[PDB]
Amino acid sequence: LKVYNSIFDQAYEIDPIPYFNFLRKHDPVHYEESIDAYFVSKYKDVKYILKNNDIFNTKTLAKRAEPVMKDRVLAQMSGQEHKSKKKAILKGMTGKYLENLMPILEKRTNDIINKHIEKKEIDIVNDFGKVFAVQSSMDLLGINLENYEKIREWHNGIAKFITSFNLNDEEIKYSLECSDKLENYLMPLIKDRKKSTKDDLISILLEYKNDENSISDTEILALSLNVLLAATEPVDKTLAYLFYNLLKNPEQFESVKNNPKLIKNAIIETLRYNSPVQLIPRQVSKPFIFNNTELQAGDTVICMIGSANRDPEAYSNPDEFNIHRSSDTSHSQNLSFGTGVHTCVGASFSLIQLEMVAILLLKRLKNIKLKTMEITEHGIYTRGPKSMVISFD
Numbered sequence: 001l002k003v004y005n006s007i008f009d010q011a012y013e014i015d016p017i018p019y020f021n022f023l024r025k026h027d028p029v030h031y032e033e034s035i036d037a038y039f040v041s042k043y044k045d046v047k048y049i050l051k052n053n054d055i056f057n058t059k060t061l062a063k064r065a066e067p068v069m070k071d072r073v074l075a076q077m078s079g080q081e082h083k084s085k086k087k088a089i090l091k092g093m094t095g096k097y098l099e100n101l102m103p104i105l106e107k108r109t110n111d112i113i114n115k116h117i118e119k120k121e122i123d124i125v126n127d128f129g130k131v132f133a134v135q136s137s138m139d140l141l142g143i144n145l146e147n148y149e150k151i152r153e154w155h156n157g158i159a160k161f162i163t164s165f166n167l168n169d170e171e172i173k174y175s176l177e178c179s180d181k182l183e184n185y186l187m188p189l190i191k192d193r194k195k196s197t198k199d200d201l202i203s204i205l206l207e208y209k210n211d212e213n214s215i216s217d218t219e220i221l222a223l224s225l226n227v228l229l230a231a232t233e234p235v236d237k238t239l240a241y242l243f244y245n246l247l248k249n250p251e252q253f254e255s256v257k258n259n260p261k262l263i264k265n266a267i268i269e270t271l272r273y274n275s276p277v278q279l280i281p282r283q284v285s286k287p288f289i290f291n292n293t294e295l296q297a298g299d300t301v302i303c304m305i306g307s308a309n310r311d312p313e314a315y316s317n318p319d320e321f322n323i324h325r326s327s328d329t330s331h332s333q334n335l336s337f338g339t340g341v342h343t344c345v346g347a348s349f350s351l352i353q354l355e356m357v358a359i360l361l362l363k364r365l366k367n368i369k370l371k372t373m374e375i376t377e378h379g380i381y382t383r384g385p386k387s388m389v390i391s392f393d
């Protein structure tokens with residue numbers, strides 16, 4: 001039976017919401033032959049997939065990412081190893097490490113603001129988010145900001161490899177060249193940190209011990225690259241989406257201005273409404289069936305986080321932005337950080353960092369007005385506005 005609606009239609013990337021509605025209603029487990037994978041659109045099926053790491057495993061991430069990551073990433077691990085190494089990464093963004101980091105992130109934020117405050121406008125995507133996001137990631141890791149701009153360039157190249165389907169011969173080579181340059185820059189710093197242990201995540205990874213057993217330097221590089229990629233991408237997107245959605249709903253923007261504590265809920269609702277990480281793949285380990293769609297071992301399923309997060313079975317009026325949602329007619333925990341074993345280790349830090357930035361932008365940019373009246377969004381795997389310019393006094 002031929003199907004005519006395709007994730008890879010040009011219309012989908014422009015506006016995927018009609019596709020989410022169609023797929024959830026008429027094809028919740030939808031086959032795409034161009035990448036030999038099934039797309040899963042409903043909240044309850046995505047949740048089930050992500051909660052069942054034994055049936056739907058993370059082995060698909062060994063060729064979609066490992067070629068550029070140089071070694072095993074966290075998502076490829078399991079058992080005590082995954083648990084202990086995930087805890088090590090969390091350590092770098094909790095406790096005293098978090099206390100130390102946040103003032104630095106405040107400095108990053110105000111320095112960017114100060115560069116733009118006299119121009120009376122700023123592009124939350126291109127002026128703020130893309131700069132802050134990589135700087136924050138480098139501060140978290142302990143990489144000094146001198147070669148910051150080249151770090152951005154390479155990051156973009158590796159990201160493209162991981163977030164893209166059916167890359168051509170020349171795109172693959174550039175992504176790998178970016179991976180090598182990043183490897184060539186970062187390895188000496190790991191070697192230096194090996195002797196000069198600092199209070200950063202790189203040092204944590206060097207100090208880690210699996211029973212008097214350290215992890216190879218190339219293992220630390222991949223995990224460091226895993227953190228750089230993981231933390232940078234979603235930050236610019238979410239910040240842009242947050243202020244866009246608030247300014248498009250002036251009542252809610254004012255509520256946030258009058259009650260700063262509502263900022264957390266606005267970020268959460270932004271993550272639900274405009275999920276910046278859109279797709280999460282898994283590999284099927286054994287015959288399985290959702291609705292009446294049969295899956296075989298070896299098949300690939302791709303969870304559609306944005307679709308799930310707008311499922312009317314999980315949220316009332318799911319396609320409306322409302323920072324005042326709560327479970328106290330229908331509300332659920334959003335899947336924007338995933339769920340189960342591989343739930344985003346950086347979830348709490350992300351909410352803290354985004355609230356810090358939002359509060360400073362709201363403090364320092366007075367009488368914010370929207371200038372980008374209508375956004376253009378790009379990306380199907382990770383996804384955000386091209387530009388989001390605001391004006392201010």
Ligand code: HEM
Binds near residue numbers: 344
């Ligand atoms: C708004 C910001 C972010 C969002 C929306 C986001 C989204 C996600 C999602 C959806 C997953 C699950 C992927 C899967 O199940 O395969 C994930 C995992 C992960 N995220 Fe994030 N993330 C964010 C920020 C960060 C930050 C700041 C870091 C590092 C500091 C980070 C590091 C990770 C890691 C290491 C994993 C893998 C966890 C595991 O395998 O156990 N993320 N993230």
Ligand SMILES: COc1ccc2[nH]c3c(c2c1)CCNC3
Binds near residue numbers: 382
């Ligand atoms: C750069 O492109 C990607 C591709 C897959 C990804 N998965 C996760 C992130 C990410 C970024 C960021 C946060 N952690 C989960």
